[PDB]
Amino acid sequence: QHERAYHKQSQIFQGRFLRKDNARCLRFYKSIGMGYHTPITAINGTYIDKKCPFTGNVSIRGRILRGVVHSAKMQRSIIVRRDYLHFVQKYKRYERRHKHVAAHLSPCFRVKEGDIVTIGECRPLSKTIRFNVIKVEPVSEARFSPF
Amino acid sequence: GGIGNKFRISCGLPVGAVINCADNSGAKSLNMIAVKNWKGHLNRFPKASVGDMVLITVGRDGKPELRRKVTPAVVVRQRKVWRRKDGVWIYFQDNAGVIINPKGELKGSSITGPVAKEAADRWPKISTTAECVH
Amino acid sequence: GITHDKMYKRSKTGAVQGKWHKKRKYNLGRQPANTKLIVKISTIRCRGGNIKRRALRLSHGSFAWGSADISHKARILQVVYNSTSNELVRTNTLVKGCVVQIDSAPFKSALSNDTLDKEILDQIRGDHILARISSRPGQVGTADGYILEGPELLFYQKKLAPK
Amino acid sequence: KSIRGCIVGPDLHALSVVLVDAGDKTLPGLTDVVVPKRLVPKRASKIRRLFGLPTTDPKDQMLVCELIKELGHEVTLKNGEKKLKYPKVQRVVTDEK
RNA sequence: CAUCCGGUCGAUCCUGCCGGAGCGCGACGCUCUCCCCAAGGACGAAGCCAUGCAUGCCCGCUCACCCGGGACGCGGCGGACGGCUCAGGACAACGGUUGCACCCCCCGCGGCGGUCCCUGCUAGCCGGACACCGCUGGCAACCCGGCGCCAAGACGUGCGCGCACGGGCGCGCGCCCCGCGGGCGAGCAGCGUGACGCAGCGACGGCCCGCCCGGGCUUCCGGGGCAUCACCCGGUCGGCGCGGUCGCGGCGCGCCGAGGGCCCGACGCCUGGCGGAGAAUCAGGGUUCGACUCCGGAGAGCGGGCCUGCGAGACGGCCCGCAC
RNA sequence: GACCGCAGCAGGACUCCGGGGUCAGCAGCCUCUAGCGCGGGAGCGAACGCGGCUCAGGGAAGUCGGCAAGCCGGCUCCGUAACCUCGGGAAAAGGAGUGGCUCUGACGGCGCCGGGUCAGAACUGGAACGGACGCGGGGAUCCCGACUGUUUACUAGAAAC
């Protein structure tokens, strides 16, 4: 046991695994609002996550935005690249512009770089992470896309 | 400009001593060029005690105007222990001095740290300006 | 002058931020009251004038056994496994999530009882029922906890194992 | 602020002292003189206690008065019109109370 | 609110600037017959300041003088708003747009109001006591020492519904999800039941909840120049556990990873940088200025630290270093 | 230990073998084995000398000149400029720690047995730790010679060769 501390989902009481082998609930699969279906990977998954969008104690309140995954190299977190056009007024022309949003990728969905994801606003969960991934729309094996 | 007949006290600061500034005049360190009222003897470096007017030069530490000139100063603190005739043997942590004209006016408005009674009795302006006489 | 402002920190790019205002009282932090365990609850006036209780030294707490539904005050004998700092274990500081040995005497009667598991009934005889504190004594002024039950116990027994 | 020390010294130019037990000789200014108290109790529970109402219902009119007319009336020559200088009785139960 | 004209030549046609010509906003000169309105120590001196004045009001309690007026005192409420300036600050402020299921709030307004035992309590009703003041004072000043008298809606106690009751602590939905609520786009609230703690406030009983206003953070977009700044950061980027806070979060601390940002210009440097609503000029598209009038920010010589507070890291509060 | 220098002269003489502890060390310091008590002894504790110590306050004012002495030094981690033939400079300059205990971690062969190094933490001791020992003071320039080398045995080690 190399983990300094045990990890327990807060919603389920520890004396449920010990006995009552017959029934009860040992995992809390809360369903997110805004017409997004809690995935079965969360329903049957073994992950804990305090900041998981579905099982964990987090609420998706505020806006919901979509972006491509610039990076998946932190622990259960991704950076979503947002590509948009900003219109400069004097020149009747737009500028391609980019902003990077840090989001929490819960272990339920699987994300590889280059995939569309939906990120929903959450209570600040880190210095930079104020958004939690709700959905992943996987793209092909391999441009500027405004989502 | 010294007021009174001082009793002799042990002189701990010979020529070459770099005494610290005790005033806000702008000098940080003062080098002792020479001692006033000194008829020396052969080979004896001129030596000075607390309350004794000395001629000093200000080193590269000091403000530019103060530098490059022989200026009058009084030693207000000495590390060497000295015996007042009352029998007290007193010494201060550092050797420090105040830039003053021979008349008695001081270049800097403020004096820092304790100042010896010997300086303050001999020079009245020293007594008024200094926070503590010890 | 302890503060929880983000102005003092760097930007996400590592760029030094510039300071626009002086320290504010609303953005204030307080010296941590590591709660020593004896082998006094201070009152502090917070924002809004609300008074939060800070336990500095607290002897016992309302520990509980949920599966057997028996919950009694018990004495905190000793602190084991802080999980953040080993220094806190040997100074017997009280934080939430702090495993602790409560005296088995209030729960001694249940030893006669049976069917409430078997491992937890063995602890009743020893005088050492393991229990994690559930309340932040610095903020809530109380050290009420819960006896470790089931796998959490097995993990915290393996951690505490004599090796 | 600068405050003098608890231990007494030659420096103090003034000291203060409370005579407790004393010698037989009466002090020329202290033991002989007896200062009249300027005022009297106004709290009713104290006023009932002063007249020993507990020793022997709301007293109401047991209250005493300086009886010395009214303050600020000497120039008006209202000295003959002597109001009862009753200290106002406070803590007294009333029927309104 | 679509306009040109003078100047290189010996002449000419150009390019191209120079100069005029218009309109503001300030200085200077000279000159102003009267009235109406109106700006007015901002401009690399947020330099320094003599003096005067800018926050009082109130009567809960009233045995000096004067009458119903009380002075002084204690107590309350306010002094955090206002007035002032633009130094600092360039993913900051500021604007438009979100959220707080992560929150604090005086007043006022509307609800609601049960307060454990047990010892000792007085509940027609409790103490003892401080200031003013009486006396007796030191001190250059500033500042205040003792000893006694004695009030509060002040102070400390305090009886009072074991559906007693603050905080916090347990156990209390799921069978793939979503299709009802006290409710919600959202498993949120409330309660039951365990145990803890005795939180309120009661000496002219009122906690508490709401709404308001005012916060605190927060989401997205917009948010100066300089490459004679090309790589940058190292709580920096994430995880996890605690602590702290009104709460959230590297906010702090351990621990564990190795991220995070960038030629769509990161980072560094610089500014005679407060931002917006706006102002000037003015076919159109624009250019320039954003001191100041309203709004938001910031600051009270320069840094720190606090106390009182419902709210201030307050400076016509305090403490300390610095500079004068 | 008898050679060769006047001699049974702190002069000069080529090898072989080479334990322990502290240590990076065949260094310094102390020792096991082995050897062994040196042109004599006693007394005294003057000046002066020679070999060493320590010194208040100042800090090269001494002197032809910092001569001589002192300062610095081991290790570990940071932190290092001008210049430059890009190799250096550089141990630049400048800091901080260091003991004794009590324990943790890592690193192998693989029933089980090494290794002595590396970290990290308590806790302690007049405010102490390379505790003796060993063991750069540093920097800014000018001249000359590029350097490493060689040199007047017995007054010149240099810029000379």
> Residue holding tokens 């609303």?
C26
Give me the domain span that covers residue C108: 30-163
Q: In Å, how far are C75, C80, C145 from C119, measured between CA atoms?
A: 21, 19, 19
Structural tokens at position B4: 């009174």
Residue C149 domain flag: yes
Q: How far apart are CA C149 and CA C130, in angstroms?
A: 9
Question: Quick one: CA dihedral A29, C134, C61, A16, positive or negative?
Answer: positive
The DSSP bridge partners found for residue A79 are A71, A102
Residues D16-22: contacts with CB under 8 Å, at least 24 apart: none
CA nearest to A17 within chain C: C150
Residue C62 lies in a domain: yes
Give the DSSP per-residue string, B35-72. Answer: ETT----TTPPPEE-TT-EEEEEE-TTS-TTTTTS-EE
Instruction: Identify whether the C-beta of residue B119 lies closer than 8 Å to the C-beta of residue B76.
Output: yes
The bridge status of strand C35-36 relative to strand C93-94 is: antiparallel
Q: Pick out residues 100-129 of chain C having their CB under 7 A from any atom of nucleic acid strand E.
A: none
List the C25 CA – E313 C1' distance (angstroms). Answer: 5
- Round to a whole number and report the distance in Å from the CA of D53 to the C1' of F13: 131
8 A C-beta contact, residue B3 and residue B70: no
Residues of C with CB under 8 A from a CB of A: 6, 9, 12, 66-67, 83-84, 97, 117, 148-152, 155-156, 158-159
Separation between Cα atoms, residue C101 and residue C120, nearest integer Å: 13
B10 bridge partner residues: none
Nearest-angstrom CA–CA distance, B101 and A44:
93
Residue (of B99, B123, B117, B107) closest to B19 by Cα position: B99
Question: What's the Rg (C-alpha) of chain C?
Answer: 20
Contact A14 C151 (CB under 8 A): yes
Q: Which of C1, C41, C51 is nearest to C22 (CA)?
A: C1
Q: Does C18 reside within a domain?
A: no
Q: What is the SS3 assignment for B26?
A: coil
> Which helix (H) or strand (E) element contains residue A83?
strand A77-88
Q: Nearest CA to A81 among A128, A114, A126?
A: A114
Q: Is C156 exposed, middle or buried (0-12, 13-18, 19+ CB in 10 A)?
A: buried
SS (H, E, C) D1-16: CCCCCCCCCCCCCCCC
Instruction: Give the chain C residue nearest A16 (alpha carbons).
Output: C150
Task: Count CB neighbours of D88 within 10 A.
Answer: 7
Distance of alpha carbon A98 from alpha carbon A131, whole angstroms: 17
The closest CB to that of C67, out of A5, A15, A127, belongs to: A15
Long-range contacts (CB closer than 8 Å, 24 or more residues apart) made by D51-59: D58/D92, D58/D93, D58/D94, D59/D92
A5 contact residues in C (CB cutoff 8 A): 83, 97
Q: Distance between terminal CA atoms of chain B?
A: 22
In a domain, C127, yes or no: yes
Q: Which nucleotide is nearest to B17 (CA to C1')?
A: F58
Report the alpha-carbon distance of residue C3 to residue B134 in Å, rounded: 44
What is the distance between the alpha carbons of residues B65 and B62, in angstroms, rounded to a whole number?
Answer: 8
Q: Which of A6, A15, A16 shows the shortest C-beta gap to C155?
A: A6
| Any domain includes C12 | no
DSSP-assigned states of every residue in A15-31? TTTSS-TT-S-SS--PP
Residue D53 CA to residue D49 CA, distance in Å, equals 6
Residue C17 lies in a domain: no
Cβ burial of C22 (10 Å; 0-12, 13-18, 19+) is: exposed
Nearest nucleotide (C1') to the CA of residue C90? Answer: F122
- Distance CA C19 to C1' E304 in A: 15
Closest C-alpha among C33, C21, C10, C9 to residue C141: C33
Q: Which residue has the tokens 């403000």?
A: B63
Residue of A nearest to C119 (CA): A18
* Strand E nucleotides where any atom sits below 7 Å of a protein CB: 61-67, 69-70, 88-93, 98-102, 104-106, 124-127, 133-134, 136-139, 143-153, 166-178, 184-188, 194-197, 215-223, 232-255, 257-264, 266-268, 273, 285-287, 297-300, 303-314, 323-324
Nearest Cα neighbor of C55 from C47, C70, C44 is C44
Count residue pairs from A and C with Cβ separation < 8 A. Answer: 39
Host H or E run for residue C140: helix C137-140
Residue type for position A38:
T
Match 């209780």 to its residue by tokens: C53
Taking alpha carbons only, the member of A124, A119, A107, A121 closest to residue A69 is A119
Q: How was this structure determined?
A: cryo-EM
Provide the residue type at C130 as one letter.
L
Residue type, C156: Y
When CB atoms are compared, the residue of A18, A102, A127 closest to C117 is: A18
C25 inside domain:
no
Q: Which residue has the tokens 């690249």?
A: A81
- The phi, psi pair for B129, rounded to 5°, reads -70, -40
Contacts of D60 (CB under 8 A, 6+ apart): D92
| Residue C109 maps to a domain | yes
Partners of A87 in the beta sheet? A94
Note the CA–C1' distance, B1 to E198, in angstroms.
79
Domain count for chain C: 1
Alpha carbon A61 to chain centroid distance?
13
Burial (CB < 10 A; 0-12, 13-18, 19+), residue A58, is buried
Count Cβ atoms within 10 A of the Cβ of residue D90 and give its class: 0-12 exposed, 13-18 middle, 19 or more buried.
exposed
Please answer whether residues D46 and D92 qualify as being in contact, where contact means their C-beta atoms are separated by less than 8 angstroms. Answer: no
* Residue D38: nearest nucleotide (C-alpha to C1'): E149
Residue C111 has a CB neighbour count (10 Å cut-off) of 13
* Chain C residues with beta carbon closer than 8 angstroms to that of A14: 148-152
Question: Which helix (H) or strand (E) segment is B122 a member of?
Answer: helix B117-122
Given resolution (angstroms): 3.4
Is the C-beta of residue A81 closer than 7 Å to nucleic acid chain E?
A: no
Torsion of CA C135, C136, C138, C139, to 10 degrees: -90
Q: Nearest chain C Cα to A126, which residue? A: C12
**Residues paired with B75 in a beta bridge:** B97
Token code pair at residue C56: 């500095």
Inter-residue contact A130 to A145 (CB < 8 Å): no
DSSP C44-93: EE-GGG-EEEEESB--EEE--BTTTTB--EEEEEEE---SS-HHHHHHTE
> Is it the case that chain C and chain A have 3 or more CB pairs lying under 8 Å apart?
yes
Q: How far does the CA of D41 sit from the C1' of E58, in Å?
A: 27
Q: Is B43 annotated as a binding residue?
A: yes
- A22 sits within 7 Å of strand E by its CB: no
- Check CB contact under 8 Å for C151 and A17: yes
Are C26 and C46 a contacting pair, CB within 8 Å?
no
Contact flag A19-C67 (C-beta cutoff 8 Å): yes
- Residue A20, CB, strand E, below 7 Å: no
As given in the structure block, the two tokens for residue B47 are: 């030596």
Cα separation, B46 vs B13, in Å, equals 9
Beta bridge partners of B82: B90
Question: Which of C67, C84, C158 lies closest to A1 in CB terms?
Answer: C158
CB contact under 8 A, C159 and A19: no
Q: How many helices (H) and strands (E) does chain B have?
A: 2, 11
